[PDB]
Symmetry: D3
Subunit: 237 residues, 6 copies
């Protein structure tokens, strides 16, 4: 019923978890949700709806990059009644003791994209998460006994940057993770009046060159998923 999602109103829950990888979305649905049913396959960007401890929850890929996730998050918000989006992604670390598989929560997201300047008359829009969603994730992580650091992400347009110097700048300003979506989703949420949060798992260290495998990112970043799901239940009250 939308140009990139073959589904109808009601097919999605009012909260959607979104990794960039549709195969991770499939894994999450098969592993964490009961009675999961596929609700989208357009362009292979798989989305599912099921229950978690009785709560109706959806999970769907958003693809890589600001332009990709801006399409899907917009369509979910304006045409599927989605009120909350929780991005559950991977990121690269620049800080010395942020390590592989650490969970980080993006209360804010820097970017080298032009999308928000386009929205905001070429000034600086502070791309931020919903505060209550941030707090729910923090509280859920505490209850699960999982460490999670809250701060700034950097949403990059170029995974392969010609400007390695920017990584030193990011590190100097305390950037917790480099990914490619948070700032765009946060812009969409502000534009169309919904609520968003990005939680990432560290899948690479940009300095040490340590990194997980594609298979590991697809199916073993479960801490962030437990946090995301439990945080929804806290949100419901």
């Amino acid at each position: 019923a939308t140009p990139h999602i073959n589904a109808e109103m009601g097919d999605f829950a009012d909260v959607v978890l979104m990794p960039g990888d549709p195969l991770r979305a499939k894994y999450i649905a098969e592993t964490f949700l009961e009675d999961a049913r596929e609700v989208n396959n357009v362009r292979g960007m798989l989305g599912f709806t099921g229950t978690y401890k009785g709560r109706k929850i959806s999970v769907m890929g958003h693809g890589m990059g600001i332009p990709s996730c801006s399409i899907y998050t917009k369509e979910l918000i304006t045409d599927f009644g989605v009120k909350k989006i929780i991005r559950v992604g991977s990121c690269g670390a620049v800080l010395p003791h942020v390590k592989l598989r650490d969970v980080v929560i993006g209360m804010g997201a820097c970017t080298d994209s032009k999308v928000n300047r386009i929205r905001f008359k070429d000034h600086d829009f502070a791309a931020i998460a919903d505060f209550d969603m941030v707090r729910n994730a923090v509280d859920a992580a505490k209850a699960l006994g999982i460490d999670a650091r809250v701060g700034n992400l950097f949403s990059a347009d170029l995974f392969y940057s010609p400007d390695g110097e920017m990584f030193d700048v990011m590190e100097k300003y305390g950037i917790l993770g480099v990914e490619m979506e948070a700032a765009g989703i946060y812009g969409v949420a502000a534009e169309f009046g919904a609520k968003a949060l990005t939680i990432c798992t560290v899948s690479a260290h940009i300095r040490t060159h340590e990194q997980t495998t594609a298979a590991e990112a697809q199916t073993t970043f479960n801490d962030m998923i437990k946090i995301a799901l439990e945080s929804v239940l806290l949100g419901d009250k």
Copy 2:
């Protein structure tokens, strides 16, 4: 001492409340702090240190504008061991449900200043507060029975803007209050590795034209001060 502060290490607490108005700092010191003493008067930018419920706390003006407060925040952090800065300011509102004297908490701060682009290689730095400090303010406000919205501020360089239409864009994107400092303080905090939070009292409504007096701003915005002070105690645990 530093070029704009004639004091020595120890004269300031590790937390400093900062309004733009040094006369407001003085009122706060005389009204909320016991055994208050003047620790700065360079350029008339009054700063005081005293105790609040046994806790050593400072309050000092930072002047109007990003370049003004950038100077004071830098100097406090590098030379006076300051770890937390709570800006306690005034702001104008654009949103139709935001009222005069409402308290707003700036989890993020947008800006039309160039200073963060200067820091961040001409990219978008998301100028954000420290998460724990935001939560401390929210919890303290709740305990006090004082309402407070958490969200984005906009830090303007021009109080008298030629671009009146930018207010519609701010309103569209949910900006809670227009002030002149938060994004600057947040960038300095990130640069020099400290923590910061801006809490503001709505002193004018840009749509309804309602406005408090200069006298009222100087001495009567006490809800935000109570919140800030109690938030520090929560932060100490």
Copy 3:
């Protein structure tokens, strides 16, 4: 292998056709390639290698947006020996005489992305195709009796743009189609020293609602694939 491609040197031909939709990649492999073998499925971004009239050819999706396709095209070039990339996508028209099903070839690509400014010290980089590839496509098109316009595409970051006025500007400057990838692929081609071409078919007329049948669309899609495939054989000499 790379983080985004689970294959090794040799799995890909030195020419790769890329639609945005990985399911179209599978379609192309099944319909126009002989002895097609799937060589990638990381993140569900299907890629296949086979032969067309004896010539080894690969086809793989690139996802939506400049950041997505920039990852895949970079990795193909630096790690898989890929010499030529031909994007085969869809676009929206703004010109009155450009009709649904028309084939456009992007000799250049305008953009509102910041990726090329990041590469090019904030100056104007003209994102352009390889001339021989453009010529090969024009000649292949002629031999199949298919008309094609050659000129500028516009690669947009925001499918749902808040700036409707920009479409008038694109029309005024002769933009043939609006898509979301070409300028990004062309920047990668220049950065890493390879050759690229984007060919699109018009699937929408922006400022209407007009569409064709799923049949007219498939036939037209097929026409583009044939132009792309025949253009490669011409390039081989």
Copy 4:
């Protein structure tokens, strides 16, 4: 009254000298003016009015940075009938043959602020002083046996630069001094149809009293 100035029309002369430091405004008032009276104290930004050689003159601090002085200069111009603003400040010098107690007059003011780009559709606005005021200041200095240097200032947003990249660039293109207000004041003057001048004493690489005399005497030359 305005949100930042507790006074009424007539409380200010039509010319206002403005140092950054309000305590320096007080000093100027007490030292050079007859019958000096405090006319503003909102936010502690002290302003005074009195007479210099029979001529009504006001002096008021403008605070540090473009945003601060933009508020005060605008309000003076639009709400208190002020026609001329003379900033009297300090600056740091980058040029070798520009000396450690020299008086420089900013005929132009560079900046890394975005405020004039906001005013001028993201093009380059040459932030300039009023020419007659520059002339009056040069002649006033000359009559006092001071050769003031006239040229470009640089108005910085960041007193504490993250990288200091601009210092060599300022030296290369002949900037006479570095301060934090001129480009802002000149933008306000252009936007609201008034006249402005910034005069600075090179504080780093009296003197102070000399600069003030120059400013005041330049007003009297302007009156003729």
Copy 5:
């Protein structure tokens, strides 16, 4: 007549060759055109019209820099019925394997000018040549036994640049030649609805600081003019 051209409709052919130096336009007229007559001398910017192999052809200087050539090209288009402009110039090489005397055809033109951003709402306009004119020039060069390079020029505002590093950037993204006009002409052609092409001969290597001799300069210049003229004939078919 127009403010910088004292001539009337008909005085120019529908195609105009344009060197920067008006004295070179005079040489071209005298050397290559039959029955050449001078049709402009305003500001000393000599223009001539005559025939080449029976075909009416004009040649006129455009002066140095984007602002200068933008004036002349605009006026020819809106008031003299000119359809095609061929800039014929010299350029400096940055690439090690681009040699003195090489012929470069600018299918695209990069620039550090702001003129196209002014036209294109501060986004990236890809300043491109007309495709048929590019192909006509390649084919004409081939028939003359010359292999021209086709790619990007860079059009600089500053002949004497203070930013030496930009040349490294140009070299990195494969710029074929540096001159001062192409991007401006391409911008005018798109704005006013005409066709343009820039052909240059490399007369300098920016790194080696080598410089073509006068004898080879005259030779390769003549080759460039032959290519331009014969390309017009090819285009007429």
Copy 6:
């Protein structure tokens, strides 16, 4: 000789007057200079040297636009010992009260060119004249009973600008005349350590104003040149 001036050290005086039109330089030489002779004709950019009231003076065209005049002024300063450049041109007025044939002295020059941002690390360089030169010109005019207007010029890159509304902004900020060179000449003067001034006579009113223009002055084109020449004699004292 320099790449654009076929002359030797000594052929030029240490002060050079520059109109845009080389034929105008010719006119100035013949009308005002004694024993004038041609010192350059490269690209038809005529330069002459002679005496005015015993004072050795030169006059040479600079062509149209910032990039053209930037080339000539640089070379004169670095290779011909030129100390002062006085541009003598025409300009268009945007203020209704400015008169036809009024003389405008550009103490400053705004621009939409990027050349000074390239020099000044993307910040705002105030392109200004030499103060003594400005005063000399003011005094010279006054002596001849002409009240010259002293303030900002605007140096445009596009004589045919697509942004008519920018002229409203110029009027609002008090711009006295629109031309195409001053800001560039001032940038070169500061870059290479020389002194410059632009003097213009108003030759048109730009755009239609409700008001009605003041009137028209009795001042002549020759009057402007005299002011320029006389201003040099004052400078000599």
